[PDB]
Amino acid sequence: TSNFRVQPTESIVRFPNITNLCPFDEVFNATRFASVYAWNRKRISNCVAD
Amino acid sequence: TNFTISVTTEILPVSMTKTSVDCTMYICGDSTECSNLLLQYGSFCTQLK
């Protein structure tokens, strides 16, 4: 007739324990931006983006 | 004036393993939406079964 399956009960999230916030203020609320020929590159790592 | 009795071996296949293929599990498991689109796609699964 058909095929039976076992439904899951709950969901488990196993994200790493990261507490520091990402410095989005210096990339979105900066005083000035660069040009298209001299575009800046900012590396964002090891933080939490809300 | 004489003879030589010899025994020969012949091998002939008869059958093989009976394989049944599941429809939903092989294509996309633990996915209700994929099963919904799959049923919409048509009735290929009944013909294959």
Coordinates of C-alpha atoms in Angstrom, one line a residue, chain B residues 19-41:
Chain B
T19 CA 14.6 -5.2 -5.6
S20 CA 11.8 -2.8 -4.4
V21 CA 12.5 0.9 -4.7
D22 CA 10.8 3.3 -2.3
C23 CA 9.3 6.4 -4.0
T24 CA 9.5 9.2 -1.4
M25 CA 12.5 8.1 0.6
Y26 CA 14.9 7.6 -2.4
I27 CA 13.9 10.9 -4.1
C28 CA 13.6 13.2 -1.0
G29 CA 13.4 12.0 2.5
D30 CA 11.9 13.8 5.6
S31 CA 10.4 16.5 3.4
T32 CA 6.6 17.1 3.4
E33 CA 6.7 19.9 0.8
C34 CA 8.8 17.9 -1.6
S35 CA 6.3 15.0 -1.3
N36 CA 3.5 17.5 -2.0
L37 CA 5.2 18.8 -5.2
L38 CA 6.0 15.2 -6.1
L39 CA 2.4 14.1 -6.0
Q40 CA 1.5 17.1 -8.1
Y41 CA 4.1 16.2 -10.6

